[PDB]
Write a protein that binds this ligand. Structure first.
Ligand SMILES: Cc1ccc(O)cc1-n1c(=O)c2c(c3c(N)ncnc31)CCCC2
Length: 275
C-alpha cells in the first residue's frame, strides 16, 4: 500500500459528516490539511470497527490500485491512514456524488454538449486506465463520480485487475474474458446511462434474459432525443466481436469532435430491445 499511497497523519484530517455507506464501512466528507498547509475537501472511506485481516487487505487493496493513477479523470488518492484507527482511504471530494444518481435528479435538464463533456471525461480516464494495463470490470455510471464543475472521474477500483451482468460484455459473461475491449463494452452501457439520465440498463429484466437477449444480438434502444452519432457510438461499443469495438483513444477522439461542432448532434434517433 505504502508503495503507492502516502500515510497521512490523522491530526491533519477533520471529519465533517457521514455521507454514505461503503462496502467496508461508512463514507464521510471532511477536510485534509496538506504539508504545504493548504486545506482541501476530501471524501473519507472508513474501515468498519471489528474488521477481519481479510477485509482490511481488500479495503486497502483499492488504495494500492488508485494510488498508481494520476489523471484528471480518475479519482485522486490523497493517502491512507493505517497507523491509527479507524483505517481510512482519503480521496478528492466530488460534490455531486455518483453520476447515475446525479443525472436522475436532472432528467432532460442538461444540453447535449454538457452530456458529451461528461462522457469525454470518462473516456479519457478509461484511456489512461487501459494504457496502464488495468481492466476495471465494473465500469458503470454508479461508479463514476461528478464534481461541482460537472467533471466526471472513474472510481471504485474494487473489482479492478492487472491484465455486474448489465454492464459486462457477452464474452466476459460467457467465460470471464476480460480485456480493455470488455471495458469498452461497459463504456457503451455508461454512454446509454448518461443519455438516459440514469435509467437502469435493461431495466428490471431477469439476468438470464439480459444475458440471452444480448447474445442473440439485441441492444438497448436509443434514449429519448439521443443524437444519432451517440447512439451509433453505443452500437460500436457493443459489437459482438470485441476486435471490432473502438479503442478508448478512438472514443476520446470521437467525442472531441462532437464537442467541437454541436451542429453534428442535430440528427436525432416490435420489442423493447432492438435487433
Ligand atoms: C471516498 C472514496 C474512496 C474510493 C472510492 O473508489 C470512492 C470513494 N467515494 C465514494 O465511495 C463515495 C462518494 C465519494 C465522493 N463524493 N468523492 C470522492 N470519493 C467518493 C460520494 C458518494 C458515496 C460513495
Amino acid at each position: 500500500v505504502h508503495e503507492f499511497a502516502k500515510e497521512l497523519d490523522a491530526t491533519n484530517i477533520s471529519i465533517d459528516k457521514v455521507v454514505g455507506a461503503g462496502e467496508f464501512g461508512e463514507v464521510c466528507s471532511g477536510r485534509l490539511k496538506l504539508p504545504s498547509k493548504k486545506e482541501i475537501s476530501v471524501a473519507i472511506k472508513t474501515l468498519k470497527v471489528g474488521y477481519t485481516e481479510k477485509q482490511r487487505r481488500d479495503f486497502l487493496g483499492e488504495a494500492s490500485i488508485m494510488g498508481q493513477f494520476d489523471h484528471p479523470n480518475i479519482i485522486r488518492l490523497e493517502g491512507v491512514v493505517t497507523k491509527s484507527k479507524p483505517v481510512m482511504i482519503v480521496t478528492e471530494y466530488m460534490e455531486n456524488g455518483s453520476l447515475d444518481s446525479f443525472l436522475r435528479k436532472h432528467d432532460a435538464q442538461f444540453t447535449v454538449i454538457q452530456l458529451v463533456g461528461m462522457l469525454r471525461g470518462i473516456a479519457s480516464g478509461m484511456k489512461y486506465l487501459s494504457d496502464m494495463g488495468y481492466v476495471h470490470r465494473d465500469l458503470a455510471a454508479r461508479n463514476i463520480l461528478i464534481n461541482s464543475n460537472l467533471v466526471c472521474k472513474v472510481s471504485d477500483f474494487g473489482l479492478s485487475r492487472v491484465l455486474p451482468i448489465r454492464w459486462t460484455s457477452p464474452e466476459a459473461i460467457a467465460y470471464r474474458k476480460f480485456t480493455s475491449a470488455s471495458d469498452v463494452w461497459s463504456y457503451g452501457i455508461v454512454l446509454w446511462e448518461v443519455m438516459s439520465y440514469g435509467e437502469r440498463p435493461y431495466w428490471e429484466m431477469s439476468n438470464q434474459d439480459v444475458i440471452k437477449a444480448v447474445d442473440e444480438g439485441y441492444r438497448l434502444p436509443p434514449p429519448m432525443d439521443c443524437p444519432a452519432a451517440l447512439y451509433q457510438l453505443m452500437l460500436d461499443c457493443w459489437q459482438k466481436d470485441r476486435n471490432n469495438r473502438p479503442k478508448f483513444e478512438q472514443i476520446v477522439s470521437i467525442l472531441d469532435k462532437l464537442i467541437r461542432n454541436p451542429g453534428s448532434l442535430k440528427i436525432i434517433t416490435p420489442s423493447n430491445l432492438l435487433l
